[PDB]
Design an enzyme around this catalytic site. Structure first.
Site: not given
Length: 307
Positions: A22, A57, A62, A120, A205, A207, A254, A258
């Site tokens: 995404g 995911d 997207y 969705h 989401s 985090l 998530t 990185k």
């Protein structure tokens, strides 16, 4: 060792999704219809180097099937070691219907099935000529044919789930919602309803709280406790929050730029939280005002019941 949830049909799904398509990096005025090399790179690197089954995911909306497809084609990772979630874009029409959307997707990605396919959004585009009941029936056929190993929905309220359940031959196995310490019910009573009706929640989401800590974070009980847990287990704050979501019986979804954080996300099952700890994150989280990143225009009205 890697943990899995068992859906209501007996199938296993990796209990964390560590790679998302995404989010991307594109240097242009108009980042839509700019291919992002850096996305495809981090996806490929993740598939090649992250141990265990890698849960990705993806979503039609997207517009990153090309990046994902390039990685899947070039990866050294065996198909059996990849769990692919994909989603029909009902909010913004891109295909006519689910049957077509998945077909278009399978072709772009160079695979013969997805492991999980979702509707969705319950807020169907006025431009669609299909409604929820008919969209669901198409998912049940994609399921029977084997092109979707598992099927479900995303951002559904209790009332939306009830609509599906009334007509469903195949009960929806998953409901992917926004969920975090600061948004513990996306819409009223969704978590309790879902978990009593054997519908696995995914948390998009999770985090949220960590996106940017306020300056006075160190004076706030939530963040203090999260640091304390981070030091106790010798793990990142992110890892603690991802594991908490799991301990709530919910599947954290998530993503990161990185590879380090992707590996860390996959490795959350290298430690455990106590029930006291789980309770305390829940309670400390509930003291914060809701933070909502998705379906904001639709579900802001539900913020009063979110915490």
């Amino acid at each position: 060792n890697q943990k899995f949830f068992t859906l209501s049909n007996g199938n296993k799904i990796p209990a964390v999704a560590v790679v998302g398509t995404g989010t991307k990096w594109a240097h242009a005025e108009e980042t839509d219809a700019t291919f992002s090399q850096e996305l495809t790179d981090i996806v490929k690197l993740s598939l090649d180097t992250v141990p265990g089954i890698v849960h990705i995911d993806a979503a039609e909306m997207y517009k990153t099937y090309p990046e994902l497809g390039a990685a899947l084609k070039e990866t050294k990772k065996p198909r059996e070691e990849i769990f692919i979630t994909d989603k029909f874009s009902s909010l913004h029409k891109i295909s006519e219907d689910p049957k077509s959307a998945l077909e278009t997707a399978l072709n772009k990605l160079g695979v013969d099935y997805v492991d999980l396919y979702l509707i969705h959004s319950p807020f169907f585009d006025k431009d669609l000529n299909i409604d929820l009941e008919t969209a669901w029936k198409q998912l049940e056929e994609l399921y029977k044919s084997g092109k979707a190993k598992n099927i479900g929905v995303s951002n559904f309220t209790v009332e939306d789930l009830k609509k599906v359940l009334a007509i469903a031959e195949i009960k929806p196995q998953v409901n992917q919602i926004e969920f975090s310490p600061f948004l513990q019910n996306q819409t009223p009573g969704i978590v309790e309803f879902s978990q009593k009706n054997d519908i696995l929640l995914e948390a998009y989401s999770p985090l949220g709280p960590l996106q940017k800590k306020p300056t006075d974070a160190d004076q706030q009980p939530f963040y203090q406790y999260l640091k304390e847990l981070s030091e106790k287990y010798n793990k990142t704050e992110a890892q603690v929050l991802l594991l908490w979501v799991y301990k709530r019986g919910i599947l954290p979804v998530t993503t990161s730029a990185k590879i380090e954080r992707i590996k860390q996300a996959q490795d959350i099952f290298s430690f455990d939280l106590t029930e006291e700890e789980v309770k305390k994150i829940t309670d400390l989280g509930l003291q914060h005002e809701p933070v909502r990143l998705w379906h904001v225009d639709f579900y802001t009205k539900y913020n009063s019941e979110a915490q």
